[PDB]
Structure 1
Amino acid sequence: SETRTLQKIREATQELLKYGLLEEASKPNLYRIVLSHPEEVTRILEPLDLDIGIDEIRGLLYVKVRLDETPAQDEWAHPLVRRQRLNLEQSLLVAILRQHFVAWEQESGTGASQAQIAIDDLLPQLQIYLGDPGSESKERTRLLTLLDQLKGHGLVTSPDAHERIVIRPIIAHLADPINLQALLAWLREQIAQQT
């Protein structure tokens, strides 16, 4: 009867609402289609108060809440986007990854292919703020499970066969990056104070 929305755009919208972000580096077809039909996607998503913010420089899309410009509701609330607060370890790990990504961008430029970081590099850095939980096996398992948890949010790729990881471009658009820097520096200073 009525016209049906194109198959590719339907696939794009469903995938984008499932994972929360596309990437040209891992889904070139779908990413290309959405940028060629920005009005169509933004129209499909507008009724839900959802909207896509496009980052051409890093070749990344992500779903963001659309709600109106600074109404009496200073902080947005949305039935679907359930806000979450990461636990301490996740926050510190995200701060470390944020710092690494920013540092690499400072050298290779914005949007440069992220250098692969070895798992071994991260363990000493977490040990600064968490000490040694008791064994190398325990700490490595903790790091692996934390990276698996973060992969859900799309911040990092899964460890490869050589036990390295990559930092997804999404980490640049976190909610409030000032929170990471302040907390990280605060603990980094407290450890020196107490030692």
Structure 2
Amino acid sequence: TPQRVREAVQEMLKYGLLEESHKPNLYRSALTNIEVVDRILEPLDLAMGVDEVRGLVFVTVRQGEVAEQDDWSHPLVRRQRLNLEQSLLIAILRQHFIAYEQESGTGASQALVAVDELIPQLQVYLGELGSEAKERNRIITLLDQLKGHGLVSALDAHDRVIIRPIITHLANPENLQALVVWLREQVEG
């Protein structure tokens, strides 16, 4: 087994994703050995997703013959499930990412959003608290909860957050449709 393949597998499993912009060598090594990586990860019940357009190599749960394995009962899964408040925040961040991606061209750029811009839109649904401090603390708590899932990063000195492109694979149209149907069933009865 090539050393580069093993190192790429180790790094990808440790971090959950590989980005060419930061790890071009690992990205190329894992991208050129899809069959080998699939063979190695098959006993672990894991699968690899690649987005060459956005340059990302992520790891998801391998699909078995079981109709509903729930994708959360895997022994190696450590993270908690997702509730409705975080789901709405993720949808809003996905809309922000769409807006960023529409008016974008060649060149290296990042999606940064200020908290104050996000506050009123989430106040529209959740509501408004008596003091701005309460709402700000709630928003900071939610942003920390989402950062625990690797969707965003820590705040900078100018009260801004960075939306990772991984949300694009989190809010893919299939998952969006499934969640929309589930929420519609939740509302209807």
Please indicate the TM-score interval, normalised by the length of the shorter structure: 0.7 to 0.9
Residues 111 and 162, structure 2, Cα contact 8 Å, conserved in 1 = yes
Q: 1:96 matched to which residue of 2?
A: 92
Q: Which amino acid aligns with 2:67?
A: D
| Secondary structure of residue in 2 paired with 1:159 | coil
Q: Which amino acid aligns with 1:80?
A: P
Instruction: Tell me, yes or no, if structure 1 residue 54 matches structure 2 residue 53.
Output: no
Q: 2:154 matched to which residue of 1?
A: 158
In structure 1, stretches of 5+ residues that fail to align are 188-195
Once residues 173 and 93 of structure 1 are traced to their aligned partners in structure 2, the CA distance between those partners, rounded to angstroms, is: 16
Distance 1:146 1:28, change over 3 A: farther
| Secondary structure of residue in 2 paired with 1:85 | coil
Count of matched residue pairs: 178
Pairing 1:95-114 to 2, within 5 Å after superposition: 95-108=91-104, 113-114=109-110
Aligned mate of 1:146, from 138, 142, 152: 142
Instruction: Tell me, yes or no, if structure 1 residue 16 matches structure 2 residue 12.
Output: yes
Once residues 101 and 149 of structure 1 are traced to their aligned partners in structure 2, the CA distance between those partners, rounded to angstroms, is: 19
Measured after TM superposition, the shift of residue 95 of structure 1 is 1.2
Residues 95 and 181, structure 1, Cα contact 8 Å, conserved in 2 = no
Relative contact order, CA 8 A, sep 6+: which one is greater?
1
Q: 2:115 matched to which residue of 1?
A: 119
Aligned mate of 1:79, from 71, 74, 86: 74
Pairing 1:32-47 to 2, within 5 Å after superposition: 32-47=28-43
Q: 1:192 matched to which residue of 2?
A: none
- Superposition CA RMSD, Å: 3.1
Distance 1:117 1:182, change over 3 A: farther
Q: 1:136 matched to which residue of 2?
A: 132
| Secondary structure of residue in 1 paired with 2:35 | helix
Residues 91 and 180, structure 1, Cα contact 8 Å, conserved in 2 = no
Identical-pair percentage: 63
CA deviations over 1:54-104 (Å, ceiling 9, x no partner): 110111111122224xx4x22235533648432232112111101111233
Once residues 30 and 154 of structure 1 are traced to their aligned partners in structure 2, the CA distance between those partners, rounded to angstroms, is: 19
Distance 1:120 1:26, change over 3 A: farther
Residues 17 and 63, structure 1, Cα contact 8 Å, conserved in 2 = yes
Residues 52 and 61, structure 1, Cα contact 8 Å, conserved in 2 = yes
- Structure 1 residue runs of 4 or more that deviate by more than 6 Å after TM superposition: none
Q: Which moved more, 1:88-97 or 1:16-25?
A: 16-25
Once residues 115 and 139 of structure 1 are traced to their aligned partners in structure 2, the CA distance between those partners, rounded to angstroms, is: 23
Once residues 151 and 180 of structure 1 are traced to their aligned partners in structure 2, the CA distance between those partners, rounded to angstroms, is: 23
Once residues 81 and 95 of structure 1 are traced to their aligned partners in structure 2, the CA distance between those partners, rounded to angstroms, is: 27
Once residues 32 and 158 of structure 1 are traced to their aligned partners in structure 2, the CA distance between those partners, rounded to angstroms, is: 28
Once residues 160 and 29 of structure 2 are traced to their aligned partners in structure 1, the CA distance between those partners, rounded to angstroms, is: 31
Residues 116 and 165, structure 1, Cα contact 8 Å, conserved in 2 = yes
